[PDB]
């Protein structure tokens, strides 16, 4: 599993046709873990700003299947 810190990169990987689904995890420290499932690696992005998580959420392309807390 790959940990990605660059949000834009997470967007580009999401726009890649390889990405199949994404998961949103709400941790007790109020972090949102965006886990994007690709062919070979599960790319995770931990965002500390809550509003950043929501503004991240609909910037994800609609075709991608986002999921609630696992």
């Amino acid at each position: 599993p790959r940990q990605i810190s660059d949000i834009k990169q997470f967007l580009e990987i999401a726009r890649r046709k390889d990405a199949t689904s994404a998961r949103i995890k709400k941790n007790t420290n109020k972090d949102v873990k965006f886990k994007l499932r690709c062919s070979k690696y599960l790319y995770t992005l931990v965002v500390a700003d809550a509003k950043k998580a929501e503004k991240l959420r609909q910037s994800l392309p609609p075709d991608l299947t986002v999921t609630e807390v696992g």
């Binding site: 834009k8 990169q9 967007l11 580009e12 910037s59």
Partner: protein, 98 residues
């Protein structure tokens, strides 16, 4: 910084080694000066949106600068107020690109 560790874009107009690159503090313009004597002025405009890739385009190629000892433009500075460029050459000349 939010895209990748690798460079987002690569530009190789210059025929000689690129000496200095300066970004205007306010205006969305940056300049590159090299030993070829030509200064490249590019329009680099940045959005705060995540999906919005910054728009980088060339704007001008400033020429008519002397070359001494295979040295051209050494340093370039941006005026803090408007689109004015200070270019220092190897001939002892300073150019006001207004």
């Amino acid at each position: 910084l939010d895209f990748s560790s690798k460079p987002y874009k690569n530009l190789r107009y210059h025929s000689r080694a690129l000496r200095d690159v300066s970004y205007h503090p306010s205006l969305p313009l940056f300049c590159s000066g090299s030993d070829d004597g030509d200064v490249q002025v590019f329009h680099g405009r940045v959005y705060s949106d995540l999906l919005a890739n910054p728009l980088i385009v060339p704007l001008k190629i400033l020429r008519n600068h002397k070359v001494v000892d295979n040295v051209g433009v050494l340093s370039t500075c941006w005026h803090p107020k408007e689109a004015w460029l200070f270019s220092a050459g190897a001939g002892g000349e300073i150019r006001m690109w207004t």
